Every structure is written in C-alpha cells, then in structure tokens.
Scaffold this active site. Structure first.
Site, PDB file in Angstrom:
ATOM      1  N   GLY A  38      -7.926  16.098  25.906  1.00 12.67           N
ATOM      2  CA  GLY A  38      -9.576  15.708  25.726  1.00 12.67           C
ATOM      3  C   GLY A  38     -10.130  15.262  26.957  1.00 12.67           C
ATOM      4  N   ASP A  39      -9.427  15.344  27.950  1.00 13.27           N
ATOM      5  CA  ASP A  39     -10.016  14.981  29.218  1.00 13.27           C
ATOM      6  C   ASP A  39      -8.997  15.330  30.364  1.00 13.27           C
ATOM      7  OD1 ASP A  39      -8.438  12.725  30.004  1.00 13.27           O
ATOM      8  OD2 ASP A  39      -9.499  11.496  28.816  1.00 13.27           O
TER       9      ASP A  39
ATOM     10  N   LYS B 172       0.592  -1.280   0.005  1.00 13.08           N
ATOM     11  CA  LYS B 172       0.058  -0.090   0.253  1.00 13.08           C
ATOM     12  C   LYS B 172       0.889   1.156  -0.052  1.00 13.08           C
ATOM     13  CE  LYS B 172      -3.981  -2.022   2.114  1.00 13.08           C
ATOM     14  NZ  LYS B 172      -3.455  -3.373   2.572  1.00 13.08           N
TER      15      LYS B 172
ATOM     16  N   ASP C  47      -7.353  13.516  33.998  1.00 15.30           N
ATOM     17  CA  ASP C  47      -7.238  12.299  34.940  1.00 15.30           C
ATOM     18  C   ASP C  47      -6.373  12.696  36.120  1.00 15.30           C
ATOM     19  OD1 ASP C  47      -7.207   9.283  33.080  1.00 15.30           O
ATOM     20  OD2 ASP C  47      -7.931  11.318  32.670  1.00 15.30           O
TER      21      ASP C  47
ATOM     22  N   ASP D  31     -12.003  12.362  35.406  1.00 14.08           N
ATOM     23  CA  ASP D  31     -11.661  10.989  35.912  1.00 14.08           C
ATOM     24  C   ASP D  31     -11.002  11.385  37.316  1.00 14.08           C
ATOM     25  OD1 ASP D  31     -10.990   9.102  33.103  1.00 14.08           O
ATOM     26  OD2 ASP D  31     -12.798   9.982  33.811  1.00 14.08           O
TER      27      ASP D  31
ATOM     28  N   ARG E 159      -0.323  15.546  31.236  1.00 16.03           N
ATOM     29  CA  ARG E 159       1.080  15.420  32.027  1.00 16.03           C
ATOM     30  C   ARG E 159       2.310  15.204  30.891  1.00 16.03           C
ATOM     31  NH1 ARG E 159       3.736  10.807  34.847  1.00 16.03           N
ATOM     32  NH2 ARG E 159       5.430  11.655  36.204  1.00 16.03           N
ATOM     33  N   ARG E 160       1.623  14.680  29.768  1.00 16.82           N
ATOM     34  CA  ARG E 160       2.668  14.650  28.589  1.00 16.82           C
ATOM     35  C   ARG E 160       2.909  15.852  27.788  1.00 16.82           C
ATOM     36  NH1 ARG E 160      -0.391  10.847  27.097  1.00 16.82           N
ATOM     37  NH2 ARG E 160      -0.400  11.101  24.949  1.00 16.82           N
TER      38      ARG E 160
ATOM     39  N   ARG F 170     -11.092  19.189  22.502  1.00 13.96           N
ATOM     40  CA  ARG F 170      -9.937  19.302  23.255  1.00 13.96           C
ATOM     41  C   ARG F 170      -9.800  20.535  23.927  1.00 13.96           C
ATOM     42  NH1 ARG F 170      -6.849  14.676  22.444  1.00 13.96           N
ATOM     43  NH2 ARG F 170      -4.979  15.887  23.562  1.00 13.96           N
TER      44      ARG F 170
END
Ligand SMILES: C[As](C)(=O)[O-]
Ligand SMILES: [Cl-]
Ligand code: NA
Ligand code: NA
Ligand code: NA
Length: 327
Positions: free
Chosen positions: A178-179, A64, A181, A242, A171-172, A138
């Site tokens: 997007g959310d 491909k 935690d 979360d 944290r990254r 986001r």
DNA sequence: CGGCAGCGCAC
DNA sequence: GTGCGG
DNA sequence: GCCG
C-alpha cells in the site's frame, strides 16, 4: 492455511469495518483479533463451546459465530447504518478519519465529487483527495523496490556507507504494497546526521517527490518524512512514500517497528509489558519508574539491541522472520 | 471495570 | 486540545 | 469486541 470458516469471517468482517468507520475503534479491534483466530482455525467451528475455547473469542463473539453457522445470517448487519458505505468512502481519503467523515455526511455530502466541490479540506486531505485512486491501489512489490532504489541512490550520493531498507508489508514479503517506508541509518552511529533534509531537496529537485503530507517530523533522534512520489516514466501512478532516518543504536527497534504489522507490534508491546519492559520504535527499555500515585517519575533504562534478534532474545522469544509477522 | 502504546504533526 | 496516521 |  485455508479458512474453514469463510462464510463466517466474511460476515464478521462486514460488521467490523462498520464499527471502525463509525469510531468504535476498540470494538473493531476486538473483532479483528477474533476474525484472525477464526480465519486460521484447524477446522470449521461447530459449537459455541469450541468457539469459546479459542483465545480472543468470548461469549458475545461466539454468539454471532454460531448464529451464522446455524442460520447463515447475521441479524445485526440488517441494522447497520445506511451511512456506512459513504463514511467508508470519505475515510478512504488520506487524512480523513471517522470524525471528518461524519462531519461531511452530516453536511449532506455523499460522493467524492461533493467533497471536491463543497467540502472544507486540510492540506493533507486535499492531497489525499486528488490521489484518491492511486492511493487506494496496492502497488506490485517490484515498484516498491524501484522506489526504494531511487531513495537509496540519492542517499548514497551524500554518503556511500548509509544503510537503506524498505520496511512495511514490503519487507514482510507481500506481493503488493500500500505504501513504502524507507528506513535509513549509518553503521558509524553518527553520519546519518545532516542527511534527511538534503536527501529531500535532492529528490524534489529530480522530480521524484510530488507532494508532502508532513515535510518533517522529529521524534527523538528520528526524522520522518510522509509524502508522495512518482517514478519517472509515463503511466506511473503517485505512491505513498515515508522516509525515516534514525541513529544506528535505534536501528533494530526502528526496523522492527516499521516492519510491523501493526498487530505484531501490539502483541510485542503486550509481551514486553508482562516482562516489565516497554517496546517502541526507539528501543526496548525496562519499565518506567512511577510514584505511589502510579505515575511516570523517571524513564526506564534502555537495553541495547544491535539487531532485531537481540530484541527477541531479551524478550525471551524465538526469532520470527519478517514474513511471519502478519500477527 | 480499565487497558488494549506513545508519538508528533496540522489545525 | 483533537483528529489522524504511523 | 477481549482480557484479567
Ligand atoms: C469473562 As470476563 C472475567 O472477561 O468478564
Ligand atoms: Cl537487524
Ligand atoms: Na482516512
Ligand atoms: Na469497555
Ligand atoms: Na493511534
């Protein structure tokens, strides 16, 4: 690192998403790994032989890649079901995956409006639907930071020594998230207990939590909350939040797991395996004990890890900063 | 070929 | 037990 | 899909 194979990866991403929304999870995974390898290649792939040299790219994928490189098109895309766009629309709803999307499609549904009007919805999906737009966007990390602060403040009111950290893409170091935690623990190894519930009560009583996706989830000694929040003020959108409370001895591994990314976690489990160990959000352990039939008969021994680097060390790996954990 | 992790929840 | 998301 |  600029992508020298964009016209390729682009087309490859379209085919991937298609398999994904149609259930072919593993095939979609395979594509994702190759798509990453490509994005970061030290040059535009010019031969089928070169393509095959890159781990993660086999004969099929090379086929491909070279077809696009030479012809500029991918014939397969021309045979992608007409449903894909709608299946993706429906699966963008929190709580609805490929099976639910397929069911709705087969019932003749085509718009988010058809869903709202004639589809059977779960509690989670209904919440996912009324927050469709909000959840699809986001948020700026600055907002994630305010959300983290809100939770930490309400938590320290119960115990000032509690440790709170926002994980995930935030944290990254991503500009947008997007959310959110929020991982919570306590250095004394015990005072994190009896915090979860009253922390949720407090946050509800102050109008911060607007909806619950999963009010409580018990995974070992970890208490996880999946919900929806909205900062005070006009113009604020609803956001995925979360909350996870863990005992201090599992903090490092919990931190590692919830920081991700998902691909990073997957590569770390694979590595642990080759070393005869296992990695979870709970701990790094020696492989489980299994009988002749090759089946778990006894759990492994937990290898203590006070901090993330302790985990890398025991895996014989050089520490990698959160920012470098996309893959 | 099987593995690509294992989990707990709503249903 | 299945679907789903973490 | 890829890998061993
Ligand atoms: C190339 As092979 C050993 O995965 O069939
Ligand atoms: Cl740490
Ligand atoms: Na979904
Ligand atoms: Na297969
Ligand atoms: Na899963």
């Amino acid at each position: 690192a600029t992508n020298h194979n964009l016209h390729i990866t682009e087309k490859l991403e379209v085919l991937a998403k298609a398999y994904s929304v149609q259930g072919d999870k593993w095939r979609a995974l395979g594509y994702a790994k190759a798509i990453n390898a490509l994005k970061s290649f030290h040059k535009p792939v010019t031969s089928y032989q070169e393509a095959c040299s890159i781990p993660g790219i086999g004969k099929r994928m090379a086929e491909k890649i070279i077809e696009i490189l030479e012809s500029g098109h991918l014939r397969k895309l021309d045979h992608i079901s007409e449903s894909v766009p709608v299946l993706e629309l429906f699966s963008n709803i929190w709580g609805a995956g490929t099976k639910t999307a397929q069911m709705w499609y087969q019932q003749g549904f085509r718009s988010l409006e058809d869903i709202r009007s004639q589809a059977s919805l779960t509690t989670q999906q209904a919440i996912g639907l009324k927050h469709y737009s909000d959840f699809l966007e986001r948020m700026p990390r600055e907002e994630a930071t305010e959300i983290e602060q809100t939770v930490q403040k309400a938590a320290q009111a119960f115990n000032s020594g509690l440790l709170c950290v926002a994980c995930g893409s935030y944290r990254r170091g991503k500009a947008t998230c997007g959310d959110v935690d929020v991982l919570i623990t306590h250095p004394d190894g015990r005072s994190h207990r009896g915090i979860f519930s009253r922390l949720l009560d407090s946050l509800r009583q102050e109008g911060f939590l607007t909806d619950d996706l999963v009010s409580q989830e018990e995974n070992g000694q970890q208490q996880k909350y999946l919900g929806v929040c909205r900062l005070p003020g006009p113009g604020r959108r609803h956001r995925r939040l979360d909350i996870i409370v863990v005992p201090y001895s599992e903090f490092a591994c919990a931190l590692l797991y919830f920081t991700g990314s998902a691909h990073f976690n997957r590569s770390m489990r694979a590595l642990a395996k080759t070393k005869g160990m296992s990695l979870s959000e709970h701990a790094l352990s020696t492989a489980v004990v299994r009988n002749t039939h090759g089946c778990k008969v006894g759990p492994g021994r937990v290898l203590p890890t006070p901090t993330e680097k302790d985990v890398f060390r025991l895996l014989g790996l050089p520490y990698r900063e959160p920012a470098e954990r996309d893959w």
